[PDB]
Amino acid sequence: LLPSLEDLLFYTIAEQEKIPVHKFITALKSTGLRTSDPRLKECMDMLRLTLQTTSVMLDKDLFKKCVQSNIVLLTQAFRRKFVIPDFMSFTSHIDELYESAKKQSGGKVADYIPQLAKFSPDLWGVSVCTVDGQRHSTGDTKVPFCLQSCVKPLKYAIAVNDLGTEYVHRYVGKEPSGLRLFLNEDDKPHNPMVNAGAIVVTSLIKQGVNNAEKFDYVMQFLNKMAGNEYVGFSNATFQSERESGDRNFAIGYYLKEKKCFPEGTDMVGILDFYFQLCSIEVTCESASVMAATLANGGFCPITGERVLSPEAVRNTLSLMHSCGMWDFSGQFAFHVGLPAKSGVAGGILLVVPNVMGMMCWSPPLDKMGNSVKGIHFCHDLVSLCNFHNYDNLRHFAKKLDPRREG
Amino acid sequence: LPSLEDLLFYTIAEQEKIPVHKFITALKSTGLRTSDPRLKECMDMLRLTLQTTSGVMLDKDLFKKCVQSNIVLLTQAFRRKFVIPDFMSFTSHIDELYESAKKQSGGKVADYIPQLAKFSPDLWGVSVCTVDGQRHSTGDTKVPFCLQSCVKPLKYAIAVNDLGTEYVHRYVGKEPSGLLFLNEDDKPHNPMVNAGAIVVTSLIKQGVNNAEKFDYVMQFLNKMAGNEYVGFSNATFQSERESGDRNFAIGYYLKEKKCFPEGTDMVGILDFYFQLCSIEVTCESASVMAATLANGGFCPITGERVLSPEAVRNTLSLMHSCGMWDFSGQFAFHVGLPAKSGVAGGILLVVPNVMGMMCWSPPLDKMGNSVKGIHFCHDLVSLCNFHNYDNLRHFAKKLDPRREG
Amino acid sequence: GLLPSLEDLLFYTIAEGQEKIPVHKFITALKSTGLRTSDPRLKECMDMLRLTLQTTSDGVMLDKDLFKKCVQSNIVLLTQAFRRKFVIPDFMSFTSHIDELYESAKKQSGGKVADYIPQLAKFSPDLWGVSVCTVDGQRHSTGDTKVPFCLQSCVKPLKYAIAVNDLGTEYVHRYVGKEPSGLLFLNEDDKPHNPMVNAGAIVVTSLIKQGVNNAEKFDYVMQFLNKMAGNEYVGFSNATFQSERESGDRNFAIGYYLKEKKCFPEGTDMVGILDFYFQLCSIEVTCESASVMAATLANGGFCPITGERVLSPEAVRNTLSLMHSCGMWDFSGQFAFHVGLPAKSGVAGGILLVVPNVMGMMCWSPPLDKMGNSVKGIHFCHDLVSLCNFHNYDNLRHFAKKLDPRREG
Amino acid sequence: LPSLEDLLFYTIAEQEKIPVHKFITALKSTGLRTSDPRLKECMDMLRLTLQTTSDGVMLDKDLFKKCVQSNIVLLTQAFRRKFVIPDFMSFTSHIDELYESAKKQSGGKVADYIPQLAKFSPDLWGVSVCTVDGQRHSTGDTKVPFCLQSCVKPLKYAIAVNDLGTEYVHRYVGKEPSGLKLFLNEDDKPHNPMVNAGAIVVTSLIKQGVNNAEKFDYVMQFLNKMAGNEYVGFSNATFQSERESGDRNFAIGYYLKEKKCFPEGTDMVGILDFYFQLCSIEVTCESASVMAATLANGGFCPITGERVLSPEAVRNTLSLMHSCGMWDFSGQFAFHVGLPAKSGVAGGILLVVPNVMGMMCWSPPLDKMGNSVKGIHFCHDLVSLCNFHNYDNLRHFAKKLDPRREG
Ligand SMILES: NC(=O)CC[C@H](N)C(=O)O
Ligand SMILES: NC(=O)CC[C@H](N)C(=O)O
Numbered sequence A: 001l002l003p004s005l006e007d008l009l010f011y012t013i014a015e016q017e018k019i020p021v022h023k024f025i026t027a028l029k030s031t032g033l034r035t036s037d038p039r040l041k042e043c044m045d046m047l048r049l050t051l052q053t054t055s056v057m058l059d060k061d062l063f064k065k066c067v068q069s070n071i072v073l074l075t076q077a078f079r080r081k082f083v084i085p086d087f088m089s090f091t092s093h094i095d096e097l098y099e100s101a102k103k104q105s106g107g108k109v110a111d112y113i114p115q116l117a118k119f120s121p122d123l124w125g126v127s128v129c130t131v132d133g134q135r136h137s138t139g140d141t142k143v144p145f146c147l148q149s150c151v152k153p154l155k156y157a158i159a160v161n162d163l164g165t166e167y168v169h170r171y172v173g174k175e176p177s178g179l180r181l182f183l184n185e186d187d188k189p190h191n192p193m194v195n196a197g198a199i200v201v202t203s204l205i206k207q208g209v210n211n212a213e214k215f216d217y218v219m220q221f222l223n224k225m226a227g228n229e230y231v232g233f234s235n236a237t238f239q240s241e242r243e244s245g246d247r248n249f250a251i252g253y254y255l256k257e258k259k260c261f262p263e264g265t266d267m268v269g270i271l272d273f274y275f276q277l278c279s280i281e282v283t284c285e286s287a288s289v290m291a292a293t294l295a296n297g298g299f300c301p302i303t304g305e306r307v308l309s310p311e312a313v314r315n316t317l318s319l320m321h322s323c324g325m326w327d328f329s330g331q332f333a334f335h336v337g338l339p340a341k342s343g344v345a346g347g348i349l350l351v352v353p354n355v356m357g358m359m360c361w362s363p364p365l366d367k368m369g370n371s372v373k374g375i376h377f378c379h380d381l382v383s384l385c386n387f388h389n390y391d392n393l394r395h396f397a398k399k400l401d402p403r404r405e406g
Numbered sequence B: 001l002p003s004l005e006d007l008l009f010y011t012i013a014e015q016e017k018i019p020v021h022k023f024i025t026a027l028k029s030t031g032l033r034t035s036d037p038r039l040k041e042c043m044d045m046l047r048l049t050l051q052t053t054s055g056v057m058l059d060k061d062l063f064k065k066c067v068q069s070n071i072v073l074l075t076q077a078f079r080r081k082f083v084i085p086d087f088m089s090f091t092s093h094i095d096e097l098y099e100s101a102k103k104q105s106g107g108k109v110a111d112y113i114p115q116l117a118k119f120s121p122d123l124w125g126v127s128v129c130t131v132d133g134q135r136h137s138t139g140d141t142k143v144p145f146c147l148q149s150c151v152k153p154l155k156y157a158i159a160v161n162d163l164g165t166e167y168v169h170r171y172v173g174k175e176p177s178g179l180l181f182l183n184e185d186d187k188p189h190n191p192m193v194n195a196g197a198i199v200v201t202s203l204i205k206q207g208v209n210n211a212e213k214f215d216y217v218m219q220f221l222n223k224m225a226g227n228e229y230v231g232f233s234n235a236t237f238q239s240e241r242e243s244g245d246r247n248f249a250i251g252y253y254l255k256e257k258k259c260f261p262e263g264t265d266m267v268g269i270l271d272f273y274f275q276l277c278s279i280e281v282t283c284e285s286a287s288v289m290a291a292t293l294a295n296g297g298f299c300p301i302t303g304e305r306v307l308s309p310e311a312v313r314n315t316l317s318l319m320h321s322c323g324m325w326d327f328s329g330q331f332a333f334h335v336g337l338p339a340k341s342g343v344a345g346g347i348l349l350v351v352p353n354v355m356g357m358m359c360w361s362p363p364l365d366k367m368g369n370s371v372k373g374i375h376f377c378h379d380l381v382s383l384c385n386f387h388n389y390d391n392l393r394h395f396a397k398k399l400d401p402r403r404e405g
Numbered sequence C: 001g002l003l004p005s006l007e008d009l010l011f012y013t014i015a016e017g018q019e020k021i022p023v024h025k026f027i028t029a030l031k032s033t034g035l036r037t038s039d040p041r042l043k044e045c046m047d048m049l050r051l052t053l054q055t056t057s058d059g060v061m062l063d064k065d066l067f068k069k070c071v072q073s074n075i076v077l078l079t080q081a082f083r084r085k086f087v088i089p090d091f092m093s094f095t096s097h098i099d100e101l102y103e104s105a106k107k108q109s110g111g112k113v114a115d116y117i118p119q120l121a122k123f124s125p126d127l128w129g130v131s132v133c134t135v136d137g138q139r140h141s142t143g144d145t146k147v148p149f150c151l152q153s154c155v156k157p158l159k160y161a162i163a164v165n166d167l168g169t170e171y172v173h174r175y176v177g178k179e180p181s182g183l184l185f186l187n188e189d190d191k192p193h194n195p196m197v198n199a200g201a202i203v204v205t206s207l208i209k210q211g212v213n214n215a216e217k218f219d220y221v222m223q224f225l226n227k228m229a230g231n232e233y234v235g236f237s238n239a240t241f242q243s244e245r246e247s248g249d250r251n252f253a254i255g256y257y258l259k260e261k262k263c264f265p266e267g268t269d270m271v272g273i274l275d276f277y278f279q280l281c282s283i284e285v286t287c288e289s290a291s292v293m294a295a296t297l298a299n300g301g302f303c304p305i306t307g308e309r310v311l312s313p314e315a316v317r318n319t320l321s322l323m324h325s326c327g328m329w330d331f332s333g334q335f336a337f338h339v340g341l342p343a344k345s346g347v348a349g350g351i352l353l354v355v356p357n358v359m360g361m362m363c364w365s366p367p368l369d370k371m372g373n374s375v376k377g378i379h380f381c382h383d384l385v386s387l388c389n390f391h392n393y394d395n396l397r398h399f400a401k402k403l404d405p406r407r408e409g
Numbered sequence D: 001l002p003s004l005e006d007l008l009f010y011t012i013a014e015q016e017k018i019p020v021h022k023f024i025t026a027l028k029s030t031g032l033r034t035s036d037p038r039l040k041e042c043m044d045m046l047r048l049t050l051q052t053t054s055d056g057v058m059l060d061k062d063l064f065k066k067c068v069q070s071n072i073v074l075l076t077q078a079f080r081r082k083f084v085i086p087d088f089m090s091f092t093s094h095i096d097e098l099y100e101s102a103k104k105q106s107g108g109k110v111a112d113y114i115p116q117l118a119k120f121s122p123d124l125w126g127v128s129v130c131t132v133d134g135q136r137h138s139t140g141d142t143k144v145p146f147c148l149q150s151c152v153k154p155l156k157y158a159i160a161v162n163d164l165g166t167e168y169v170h171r172y173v174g175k176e177p178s179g180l181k182l183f184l185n186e187d188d189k190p191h192n193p194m195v196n197a198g199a200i201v202v203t204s205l206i207k208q209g210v211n212n213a214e215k216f217d218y219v220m221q222f223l224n225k226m227a228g229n230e231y232v233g234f235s236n237a238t239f240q241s242e243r244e245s246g247d248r249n250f251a252i253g254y255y256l257k258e259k260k261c262f263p264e265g266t267d268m269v270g271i272l273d274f275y276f277q278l279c280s281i282e283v284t285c286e287s288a289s290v291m292a293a294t295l296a297n298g299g300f301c302p303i304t305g306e307r308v309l310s311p312e313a314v315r316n317t318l319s320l321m322h323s324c325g326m327w328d329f330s331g332q333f334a335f336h337v338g339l340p341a342k343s344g345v346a347g348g349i350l351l352v353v354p355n356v357m358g359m360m361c362w363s364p365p366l367d368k369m370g371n372s373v374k375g376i377h378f379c380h381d382l383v384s385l386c387n388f389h390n391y392d393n394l395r396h397f398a399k400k401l402d403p404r405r406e407g
């Protein structure tokens, strides 16, 4: 009845009675998946074992032997079922967008922390990870840098995940500021995407256990969001933050005075936990998986595991849309229309919902604290593709739609 | 090789002839209306065919004679290619949401003018027009009422269409205020508040007189509504102009702050502004206007291009963040849909790529938003993965009407 | 025992040991006290001197009989003048300081004549006048002190004083606040912040003489300013009034906003009140007549050159308090701290200035600084308090090196 | 030309010898206290004369001269009704009536944010007067120690301006009411020295360079001069509680440091400590009234004659007390009362009637704006009765009475 889906896929990769391993790997990579994709491990484990047998071809039987455990995911890849079918074409566009933004040399590397915010201004990296796990990187995408305020969406998602929308917003608002004292009309910080809200959010997570276990908890959570790619910690940055955090201590003592914390909070300990979270290191590549988890409804696209509740992800994307780019948030929301969160190390965590996640990193910031190259890339991207939140999917004038074939 | 009309014919038959009522009943179940302008040739031919009797049955060749001219649309309709395939199931959910909000009898009918205070608190209508022209109304959806601030996205869309983003926003901002009148640049905060709308009004069709400015807008609103009802309440306009002290304060303040293009007659612009607020619609015709905004600027029941994609994207963005007065931030967070409320009780609602809607009930909550409409919008999104930041693949237990199963 | 008459006592002081006093010698001695022979309180004495001067061809010598005859009806005021009982006893010396202060402020030629209406733009920037009227009626002017100009916002304390005079403190402040704003139309009770800014002045205007028409209201205020000015010059610039009404978009915005917020007494015709407000801004004074108005405020509401009670002590105290904190636009806080005098500036370049218990002054020069205050006048105010212990919180017993013109040596 | 001693002697012995009690009784009726530091030589010689009895309790012209000669100028001013309030006993009667009227105002809440303030009885109420000539009057609980709290804010600003001048001090602090927490005005300075942010900055200007123990002693020595060496103490219990519960003040201090509002070389956390100490300095109504009298008298302490503050310091302090001294009530207090005043959370109101007298009113129960209810009531009543409003007129003042005039 059914010519096995393995056999079907074998005769679309051949046409020619055996398939060399290199030709299978090359074709796989042209789909956008990496050979290292964790959902492909059994297939790659079977390829490693078959290759050990001789100093290397593949009949229909050996092909079924290697692909049968992952045949569904491989088929969607090879039959152009992914969110961006023509990924190689899309990748060329990202590279042009990267090169155009590389010429933008304005901005100043933040210097308030000595601790390696002596980063080179020429550092510039862009990483893409689609909701189906297709990957592309250009530039300095393996270099660790601190999330800084890029961590704010992530830890708010964690808190809404563990505690729910209602409890979290007992303590922090859900709206942009006004031209920004610290607290809105209900004497809550305005939203989780500014320092006061992030500090209150930090006090909500894993209450009860000590700070060392809270950090372990958040790290394990970030690991799931990144599909177990690079997450780390900059103790140097942490020490800088805690010695130069005069504004944050002011916020902390103010929040404590206005009774903004859940009962039982040690505010100075929370501030320390806050500085730790800002000092978490990612790379562009690992951070883009984190964004793609947000783009994919809370499922990590390269592992398939449910990481956040959909309520946590919708809420996070909403507040990233309106509050994520500091004083530029209103203009960014209007011209780019994408959930994004910037950080003072030069990172912009960018989310194209249902499509892809991205991390852009260039240390030189503009006057509002946003990476100059990153802001430029974001504008170009949406000017090229119909990814703006309120672009139309049918009628989009000169823009390109990478979700489509023609 | 075999004809599209025949394939469609063989789908509706099973049975060498299709009864006419069978064809019509199947067509309406898709959600298209018999009166759809894109179906006029089909329906005229059906009407003419029945006159020249010879019975009431359509064989293959007669079927081809009738549907030939609109075959593409009739097939997208019949092959379940529309944005909401199981439209009748969705329709029944709309009615449920309608009946829930009907019971929310709270709020106060606006009474700063006699025309608004006249309206019964119990008038409540909801109308739906998808981006493919599928229609559904429940309640008081053929009762005329004034757009009031619901016109503000529409005239801004007209301004961006004729003038572009960069020009228009020399005069008006693009953010919620959070709080007045002017932002840090001495511009009104956004086009969705009186000060910004008054300035947007002064950008439209500069040079010509007010009668021609108005007719230019009315003809524009007619295209957005697929030529359904757009009218004018002179009674409301006269009351607006004699009780709008606040609006006169804004207008003089704008003139003092030099907020208008050079050559503006501010009191004339205020008059034009009051006229735009007094334009009348029904839920049904306003829902087509919203659907045009849902459909990238093409009117879904006529196929006509009305607005630039740029105008539509801008308007949706500012409706999202600024369209529900002091509730805008909470609406964006919990509903996540572009919407615009007005003091007559209307909420102009857009679900991008899906549909436009108009909800109307005169009683307002103390933020100025129709109580029944606010309740309906929350219910709608609690039920369907329509929130701007819902996910289209993983959406918990929400219903997705774009799908079949 | 009995009485050697006060008239004869005074005659001997003026008659330096001689038999008769020539009339010119009496006038010169009188003028040296600071009083003007035209002082309304001295009219009988001057009438009698004029009658005596009629009997003779040229000049007359006054014996004690003729002296008592001319002087008897005003002998008390004349005795205080001549026995140095006036608030500034050595007025000639003080007058020389005012002239020095005047001359050095004359050199401050910066600022910009207001030009939002043509009438204000036409005034030359070198017009500069300063006039002093003490609470005892001693007068001094230097510069362009008889040139009419519009009170503009300088009228704001005056109509507020009229409203408190007629209506009381509690009623008036149902409608307007009593504090400086800081940073925009209404305070937290939805009242204009104070009567010294446009919104509060417009509301104050709607409180005065309600129920009669605008023409009768203006006559009423005009008569009131005449009393405050001791019947010196008060007028009206219809040209300024017309330009104000056609140019004041900000004031129309304010009036529509106040109407919206229900800031007016019930029954107010708001555009009619705006018209009345433009009229009040267009009232004309000179430095000399305006200094008498200031001196009425310095003197607890008694006009010092007529002795008539013009305003209640309550109206005057309220007015001086709000001029102190709110009278110099955005510069009020600095002016209160460094000058410490109730003052009120206007866009024509006037600064109505009060030294309570001492004197009133009008300084006028059209060129304004970026805050709307006359450059020369502001310079003069600072100099005056650098020189004399007139600051609100200068101490009257220990004031270090400042002069105190109230004291003899 | 007869001698001032003899002239005064005749004025008192209407008749060849004055009894001592008669001299003392007439002296106290001028309002001067027999303990006045300016009268010590007179008082010392009087008691020494009583020891060597002889004549009895009777003073002749030569004994009177021996006793009063060293203080004759002051005693003559007193006895010849030349003090600023000549009929002091009558004025005293009015103060008493005003006191009793405010005593019936039992509203308000004692501050409870630290236990030291919470333990004070609501019914404590005292009012003390010291004129610029040293005339003294007290009614109620005027010998009960309480903390200055924010009443110290004008006193340390006055010290700062005295030592450093107006221009330097106001590089760091503004000179106007705020009207609109905010913390900072447009120039990124605290609005004025009468609010916590400005006071904290002013605290950081005094005796820069020396340690906090020496800064504190410098200030205490300064307050003791203002108070004519009457009680100035310290509540370490209040200080401990202040620093343990001053979250808001730590917020301000870190914000101030973030915005670079301190002089360079400032240890903000140590300045916060010094600030809590200044708030914990103790006075009584009687000694605090002398402090306010010093401000009333252009910087001279009226019961010692000592120059304590420059006139510049005093004028600045009185100006900012006028417009900024009663928290959110400042604008209304300036309009209706028109007197320089400073309230504090322990119930004190430091009150200055310039050229006339200083006062301290104290009652712990505060109103919703932080001001003592009985004290606010007394200040209104005082100015309703007397032409002491800054913009009252000294010649035409309606039905008010002027205690400076005789009739
Ligand atoms: N803006 C950022 O990226 C955060 C920087 C730093 N951790 C702060 O809290 O201010
Ligand atoms: N909210 C509204 O619908 C406003 C309408 C009304 N005409 C106004 O301009 O205020």
Ligand SMILES: NC(=O)CC[C@H](N)C(=O)O
Pocket (backbone or CB within 6 Å): C151, C152, C153, C154, C198, C244, C248, C251, C281, C345, C346, C347, C348, C372
């Ligand atoms: N400062 C002024 O004198 C302004 C007066 C002017 N007529 C106005 O109402 O604005």
Ligand SMILES: NC(=O)CC[C@H](N)C(=O)O
Pocket (backbone or CB within 6 Å): D149, D150, D151, D196, D242, D249, D279, D343, D344, D345, D346
């Ligand atoms: N406000 C006061 O008078 C004292 C309390 C104030 N919180 C302080 O700094 O001590």
